Structure formats: structure tokens, C-alpha cells
Design a protein around this ligand. Sequence first.
Ligand SMILES: *[C@@H]1O[C@H](CO)[C@@H](O[C@@H]2O[C@H](CO)[C@@H](O[C@@H]3O[C@H](CO[C@H]4O[C@H](CO)[C@@H](O)[C@H](O[C@H]5O[C@H](CO)[C@@H](O)[C@H](O)[C@@H]5O[C@H]5O[C@H](CO)[C@@H](O)[C@H](O)[C@@H]5O)[C@@H]4O)[C@@H](O)[C@H](O[C@H]4O[C@H](CO)[C@@H](O)[C@H](O)[C@@H]4O[C@H]4O[C@H](CO)[C@@H](O)[C@H](O)[C@@H]4O)[C@@H]3O)[C@H](O)[C@H]2NC(C)=O)[C@H](O)[C@H]1NC(C)=O
Ligand SMILES: Cn1c(C(=O)N2CCC23COC3)cnc1COc1cc(Cl)c(C#N)cc1C(C)(C)C
Ligand SMILES: [Ca+2]
Ligand SMILES: [Ca+2]
Ligand SMILES: [K+]
Ligand code: NA
Ligand SMILES: [Zn+2]
Length: 805
Amino acid sequence: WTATSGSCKGRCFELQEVGPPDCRCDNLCKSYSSCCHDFDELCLKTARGWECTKDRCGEVRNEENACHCSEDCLSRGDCCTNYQVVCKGESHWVDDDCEEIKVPECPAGFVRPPLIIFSVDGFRASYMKKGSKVMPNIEKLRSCGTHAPYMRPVYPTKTFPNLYTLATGLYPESHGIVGNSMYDPVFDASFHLRGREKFNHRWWGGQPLWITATKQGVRAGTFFWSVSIPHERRILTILQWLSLPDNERPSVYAFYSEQPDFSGHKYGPFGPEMTNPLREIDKTVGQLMDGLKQLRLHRCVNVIFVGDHGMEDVTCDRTEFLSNYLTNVDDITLVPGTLGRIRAKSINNSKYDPKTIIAALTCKKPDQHFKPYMKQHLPKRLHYANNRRIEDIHLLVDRRWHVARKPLDVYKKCFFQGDHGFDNKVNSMQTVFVGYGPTFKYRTKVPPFENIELYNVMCDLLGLKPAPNNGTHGSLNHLLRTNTFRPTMPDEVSRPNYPGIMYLQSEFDLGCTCDDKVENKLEELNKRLHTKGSTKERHLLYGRPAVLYRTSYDILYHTDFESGYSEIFLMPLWTSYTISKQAEVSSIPEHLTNCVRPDVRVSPGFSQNCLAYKNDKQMSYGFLFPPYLSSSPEAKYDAFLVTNMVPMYPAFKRVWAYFQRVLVKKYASERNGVNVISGPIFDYNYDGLRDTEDEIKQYVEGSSIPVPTHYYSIITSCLDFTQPADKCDGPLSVSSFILPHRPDNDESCNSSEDESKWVEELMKMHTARVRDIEHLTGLDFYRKTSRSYSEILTLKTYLHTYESE
Ligand SMILES: *[C@@H]1O[C@H](CO)[C@@H](O[C@@H]2O[C@H](CO)[C@@H](O[C@@H]3O[C@H](CO[C@H]4O[C@H](CO)[C@@H](O)[C@H](O[C@H]5O[C@H](CO)[C@@H](O)[C@H](O)[C@@H]5O[C@H]5O[C@H](CO)[C@@H](O)[C@H](O)[C@@H]5O)[C@@H]4O)[C@@H](O)[C@H](O[C@H]4O[C@H](CO)[C@@H](O)[C@H](O)[C@@H]4O[C@H]4O[C@H](CO)[C@@H](O)[C@H](O)[C@@H]4O)[C@@H]3O)[C@H](O)[C@H]2NC(C)=O)[C@H](O)[C@H]1NC(C)=O
Ligand SMILES: Cn1c(C(=O)N2CCC23COC3)cnc1COc1cc(Cl)c(C#N)cc1C(C)(C)C
Ligand SMILES: [Ca+2]
Ligand SMILES: [Ca+2]
Ligand SMILES: [K+]
Ligand code: NA
Ligand SMILES: [Zn+2]
């Protein structure tokens, strides 16, 4: 209840929200229904429009007007944005030449350059090229400042999750806004676009930029604009705030446009009707810049022009209906559209079985335009699992499609030609980034990056310490002229042991056989030196990974590969090797087929055993260093050491064998050699983070050999591919993956065919950043390069997306 008979005179767009039942004059008052009676009269003035004209110049201030053309407007900071253009012979900002901004050029009293965040809903990355003729203010920002070709949103590629990610540097699973619509079973409440529950603060976790600012003494304008405030009024209000005195003036501001999303849904991303919404947004940018220029702030302020997500062509007829798959369709609730989330319509229905749902949704139609997942089996790059608001069953929808429960839902609600929400690597979902100001670089193009990284940079631009977040602080230093953040590499927590030969063969009772009884001092010293680390500079190109947690492990050297062997997990944390462009593939000889050899540096008690695998009828084993790529027949015996073995389901061995026997050599031919680091990942609680011993849910039968949930590989070469991977002078090139370790290939509908028709497509789906693998393993890679650490941080956040340009 609001007592809406107090006043808004001299309080219009107050920055301090006052508690009801005092009447509010701030941005959320409309969205609460609590504005003072005169809010619209005093704070939403529109008389005479938004532009000066020749006749208005020098007018007598008249306070009914929307903005002013009187002589005193500048020192009041409430001129129409085109006042000096119309009345004082000045040029529009867009008509002025680009001039480098080397230092903030700010009025006295500014303690730091302000930041303005200009966010644009549904501004797809390709609009920067395709709409350039109709967006000259935006093109100037882009060409004069720092820009990326595109920015990667988070999943799902919806508005709230993305804007809230921008604000917090957090994945949706950690900030809590995991969708535009949500059910939280702990609160037993629902969050929707429509309605009031979304305003409750228990939905919104982490710490958003405006709180981070406030807690550190930096004031903020509003981030949420009521839909009934026109864009011109948002701009004027920001300009007004910027005219405030030092002790009251915010240092961070946000503008938000509903366009071009709003049109894009009606007309498709490139509908002919889209030209006008792009013109209008551009005009709004020009208003701001002319406005800043009048106030002498246009070479003082940092401006970020950023979108939340793009827009794809989607129509009614490209809908999949769960009712075509499931007989039980009324026993489930679906969150529908460009993704799907399924839970039971009622939790008193004990008949509901997720596994049978999954099975009924799996590879049933030959061109099925969605794929069902248990949420822990989703590509780890999505980071979309560790929140009780994300339902266990998820449907990843093909680009251009929708999923719905029943046909009645899609014709009792065709209306739309555009939607978004799909997998965040889809080109159509990509969005924009331009930074313009003194703190940003001048006419600089930077590579694509993820929006989770911006919170850190915004904090850097404002002199704030970021709250803990999923950004990699430093990885965007190359966007910035100054205020870079210079991190140190984390400190190694466990130092390795380097065991020599300590055990005799007969001390091992493993159930393991190897037909290796096949007997000189030229190559006896040669092999001892391989075991003491003589080829290590070849196979460990970027130093050994640092183990960032407390554990017990051994460095094991070999001719063809080096490993960090865990005595706790009984396998390598990592195995590292280099495959030159000229390496040859050889087959596994028959004397070695089911050969596994004891490793005489590692006790029987810290080794795997073959008998466990023989007993375990579901689980087989593979190798981390692939025997197919051994350098010589004498070296191939090393690949069969028990310390190179890892548990693998036979269904996953098909994938693994193809990667090892075919793809690694293909990559080495394409990239002029590759270095490979492979290993296991254990993420049984799907938090994106390395499990401890006590989190492991599955062991090889009758043993303490833990079963990985995933296998990773990091494939590094020279960005200049005329240099070989092992002799690279400059910047590196990387691709990686995190392959789910699954007992079937249900995920791949074409898996009954030969591996050349499906394995690579699976691997691309599970592409990863090095940084994802770091979180998952507690390892820190690229410790010893000749590159700057920020450049390495950028490499570690790179994601190879396998989309065309
Ligand atoms: C992305 O970056 C983020 C931020 O860096 C990373 O997330 C962090 O991960 C940390 C490690 O998991 C985690 O640390 C835990 O914090 C617990 C205290 O948490 C509260 O306070 C913090 C600080 O202000 C706040 O951030 C939290 O907010 C969460 O919770 C509410 C909802 O409940 C949400 O609104 C909010 O969005 C956020 O939710 C997210 O986090 C929680 C987990 O905290 C998830 O469940 C949600 O799904 C969502 O993802 C909280 O308000 C603290 O209690 C934990 O400590 C336990 O473990 C240690 C082990 O050493 C032990 O010493 C402690 O005693 C404690 O154990 C006891 O409790 C156990 C569980 O109940 C019990 O089993 C034991 O028996 C023990 O008695 C822990 O330190 C940190 O909270 C989050 N922060 C955020 C914002 O998410 C994230 O990991 C990064 N992602 C990747 C892939 O890198
Ligand atoms: C999205 N929006 C809405 C919105 O949707 N309105 C008004 C009517 C409805 C439709 O449904 C309700 C209003 N104003 C915004 C901008 O929000 C932001 C912008 C930015 Cl730049 C950042 C950042 N960084 C963060 C936000 C949040 C505050 C979302 C977190
Ligand atoms: Ca949006
Ligand atoms: Ca985990
Ligand atoms: K077996
Ligand atoms: Na299959
Ligand atoms: Zn939209």
C-alpha cells in the first residue's frame, strides 16, 4: 500500500529509493504502482518534443517543456541534446573526426571517468556490418574505439540471464537467473517476465555491479528502466545526473533499449521492418553523444555498447511437440520454446520416471530438432547444471526451432518470426561489444570473448575490486589503454615426487599379462635417460601443469610422453605429448593386445589392476598416451604401462580410439605439429569443479579405481602454422574438449555408423575452454611460456566453436 498524495517536485528520478508508504519518484515506482500523483506531470514531461529548433533558441525557460533551449540550460544540464548544434553552430558528434583520447578530458571535480553501459536487447553481432549504412553513430563508436567481431552470451541466450551475467560476472547457474521463467522448489515459487515475484531479491544472487560500486563508495544510476519511460527521457535523465555536483553524481550509468529484440521477434532478425528500429537506436546513441559533447564529457566518459543476445529465424511451423513422443504428456510440466526443461507435473506421482522420458525422447524421428539430456550430461561449456532451479531433464533445441508440450499451446497463445535462447555458440545468438573512451584502446579490434568477462573490466574501469566471479581477471587487459589488472599465476600447492625404479616385477599381482619377454649399452643409457626426462622439453612444451590443491603425485617420464600420476586416484591427472607433422601411426602389435605392464617406479598399492576390469562387465580400459603414436617399437612398451591406463566404457572407447588413432594425426598435419595434454575429470556433483576423493560415486568393480565422468584434451600449436608446434616463436593456438564418459552413445543418433560420421560432431559439441578444464581438475596450464601472462589468460578463455565466420 502506497499513500500516493505526497509530491515529486525536485525529486524526479531520485537515486535513493524511499520506503513505502512514502510516494516514490524513482524508476521502479511504475513497476510497483507507487509513484506520487504528479510523477507523470513533473518527471515525464513531453511538451514541445525532444529537439531544439531555430525559433526556440534563447527562449525564456518554461518548465513545462520536455527539454530546454534557454541560455541557462547547460549549467542546469537539461538542454535538448541538439541545442548547441541548432543554437550555437556546433557540429553533431558523428560529424566530427575521430581523434584519439589519450587521457580522460574531464571537468574539474571528476575523480574518475564515468562509465555508461548502453545495452541493446537482441542486437545480433552481424547487425554491425549489415546495418552499418543506417547506424553512423554506432559505426563511429565501433571504428574509433575498441570492438570485437562478436561477443558470446551465456546459455540460455535469454535477456535476464544475460543482463544479470553482465552485471555480476557469473554464470546463470551461480547467479540464479537460469531462465526468463523459473520454478524454485525450495521457495515453492515461480519467477516470470509478467508479474511482481521477479522483483523479490531472493531470486538474484551474486553481487551486481551497482552493489559492488555502492559498497566501495561509488554511486550508481539506475539499471532497470520502466517500459513507460521513453528512450529520450532516459538519455536526458543520464545527462542530468552527470551534471550533478561531485558529492552526488553517479560514476556508473546504464541505458537499456528493448529494441531491436522487440521488432526482431515480430519480423525476424533481418526482416525489412528491422531497418527502422536500427535507425532509432542509432539516433539515441547520437543524442547521448551530442549530449555528452555539450557538457564537455565526450572525451571523459567510457561508453560500452553491448547486447544481451542475438536473434534467429523461428516460426510456428518449426515446432516439435512432445505429444508426438510421449504417451504420458499430461504428467509433465514443460518450460517451452528455444530450450526445454521438464519436471513432473506433480511430485506425488511416483510413477514418473525421468529415464523413461529421456528414452522416449531419444533419436525417435530421423531429423528430430531437439536432443534430450540429463542436465549433468549437457556440454560442460554451458555451465548449466548446478542450481536447483534447473530441472533435471533438459532439451537442447536446434537453431530455428521450438519445442512445445502439445499443439494447442502454439495455436492458443502465426505471431512471431524471430526467437533466441539457443546454445550460446550458435552464430545467430552472438551479440556485440564496443568500448569507447579514454580507458579503452583506439581503433583496435580484439578477438571474440564471453560476456562473463565484462564485470571484471567494468570494475577495472571504475577502480573497484570485483566480487568473486567466473570471469578470468586479466584475460581482457588487451581491451584497455590503462587500469589493466596484473594478476600473478596461482602458487603450486603440491610438489611432485620423481620416483626412480623401486619395485620388482614379481611384487605386482595384477591379473595383468604382457607378452614382453624380448631382450646392449648404446640404448640402455638412451632409455634410462628417457626415464630421467631427456625428451621432456619435446613433450612438455609449456612447463608442467601446477597442481593447485593438496595431493600426492608423481612425475613419470618416458620417451614419447610425460605424466603427473596421482597416487590417490590411481591414474594420471595429466599426460602430455607432442606429435610432429611428420609422425606416423602404427597399429598395436598382437603380442601387446591385452598387455598391461607394471610400472616399476610406482608401488603395486598405488596401481590399477587388470583383474578389476575383468571382473567389471560394464567397464573396460584405455590409455592416455595413445600406443598408436609411439615413436618406435621399443617406446611402444611404455604406452602399455599400468600407469598410462584409465577406465573407459566400451561405448566411449569407440570415441577415444577414433580421436587417438585418426584425429590427433589429422590435427598434427593441419597445424604443423600439436602438443596434447589429456586426462580424466571427475565431476559427480556437476558443479564445474574438481571433485575430492569422497565425492566419487562410481569405482571399477571391487576396487578403489575411480571412474571419470569426463576425459579432456588440450591441443596446442603455433598460431603461425609455418612454425612447428615444438619450435614456436610467438602466440599459440588451442582447441580443447571435455568429453562425457558415457556407457552408451545415445547422445549421437548416427552412432551405429562408422566413427568418421559421428565422433567429430560429438567432440565439437563438447568443445571447451582451457579454463573450464582448470576448474574441473585443479590444474594450472601454460606455466612456462615466453608469452605475457595476460596473453596466456586470453588463450585459456578461448573457445573453438566450429561455426562458420
Ligand atoms: C563461478 O564463480 C562463483 C563465485 O566465485 C563460484 O561460486 C562459488 O563457489 C564456491 C564453491 O562452491 C561457493 O562457496 C560456498 O559458499 C557457501 C556460503 O554461501 C553463501 O554466501 C556466499 C558469500 O556471500 C554467497 O555467494 C552464496 O550465494 C549462493 O546461494 C544462494 C542460494 O542459496 C544464491 O542466491 C546465490 O545465487 C548462490 O547460489 C549458488 O551457490 C550455491 C552454493 O554456495 C549453489 O548451491 C547454487 O546452486 C548456486 O550455484 C551463499 O548465500 C559455503 O557454505 C560453502 O561451504 C561449505 O563447504 C566447505 C568445504 O570446505 C565447508 O568448510 C563449509 O563448512 C561448508 O560445508 C558445510 O556445508 C555443506 C553443504 O551444506 C555440508 O555438506 C558440510 O557437511 C558442511 O557442514 C562454500 O564455501 C560460493 O558460494 C559460490 N558463490 C556463488 C555466488 O555462487 C563458482 O564455483 C564459479 N564456477 C566455476 C565453474 O568456476
Ligand atoms: C531488462 N530491463 C528491463 C525490463 O526487462 N523491463 C521493464 C519492463 C520489463 C519487461 O520485463 C520487465 C528494464 N530495464 C532493463 C535493463 O536491465 C539491466 C540492464 C543492464 Cl545494462 C544490466 C547490466 N549490466 C542489468 C540489468 C538488470 C537490471 C536486468 C539486471
Ligand atoms: Ca533480450
Ligand atoms: Ca565437482
Ligand atoms: K570389463
Ligand atoms: Na547412438
Ligand atoms: Zn527477445
